[PDB]
Design a binder for this molecule. Structure first.
Ligand SMILES: O[C@@H]1[C@@H](O)[C@H](O)OC[C@H]1O
Length: 207
């Protein structure tokens, strides 16, 4: 249950993933349910996550209401994100709902709107990745973001509310590939202890 190199699997009912490119190091310890701990040092790009991977046949509406209750002790040294993350396919989209970050509030673009949800106010952004690694090969795809205005590291993220706000703004979503509580680092080091992470789909916790 010690993962220090790329790996995709299921642990205690959650689909876990460790992903990095070359350079630096990371260690992910898979703990009960949706929980896990992460440590990274001098990485180029690293992601740690536990959630649900889907079979690419359903819209988020078809999957149902998605909500994540979480808690994490997040200690980044540099650029890193504490978020809900995932992808859609057809179209291929990488998405983020960011509740905390390190020294840099992402994602560097001009906001396209705002959403109020879960007692916070999030700025909404759309960015473009060109010929970058993805879940479907080296590709050019959009990234969708909701970024909280101030940091928090525990609470509930009403994931489906963000998806409806994005679609309201014309940020087209495809079939669901994944939704997961994620820690991402970029050119940084840090630690994160995700001590609470429950994904409920139509109110039912994952198992
Ligand atoms: O799962 C990995 C993704 O999250 C990362 O961003 O880049 C490529 C994918 O394989």
């Amino acid at each position: 249950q010690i993962v220090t190199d790329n790996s995709i699997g299921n642990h205690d009912g959650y689909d876990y993933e460790f992903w990095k490119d070359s350079g630096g190091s990371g260690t992910m310890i898979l703990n009960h349910g949706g929980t896990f701990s992460a440590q990274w040092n001098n990485v180029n790009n690293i992601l740690f996550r536990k959630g649900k991977k889907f079979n690419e046949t359903q819209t988020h509406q078809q999957v149902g209401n998605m909500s994540i209750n979480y808690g994490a002790n997040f200690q980044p040294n540099g650029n890193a994100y504490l978020c809900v993350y995932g992808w859609t396919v057809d179209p291929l989209v990488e998405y983020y709902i960011v509740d905390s970050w390190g020294n840099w509030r992402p994602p560097g673009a001009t906001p396209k709107g705002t959403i109020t949800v879960d007692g916070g106010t999030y700025d909404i952004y759309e960015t473009l990745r060109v010929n970058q690694p993805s879940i479907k090969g080296i590709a050019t795809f959009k990234q969708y973001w909701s970024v909280r205005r101030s940091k928090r590291t525990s609470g509930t993220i009403s994931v489906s509310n963000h998806f409806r706000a994005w679609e309201n703004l014309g940020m087209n979503m495809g079939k669901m590939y994944e939704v997961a509580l994620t820690v991402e680092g970029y050119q940084s080091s840090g630690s994160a202890n995700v001590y609470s992470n429950t994904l409920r789909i139509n109110g039912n916790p994952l198992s």
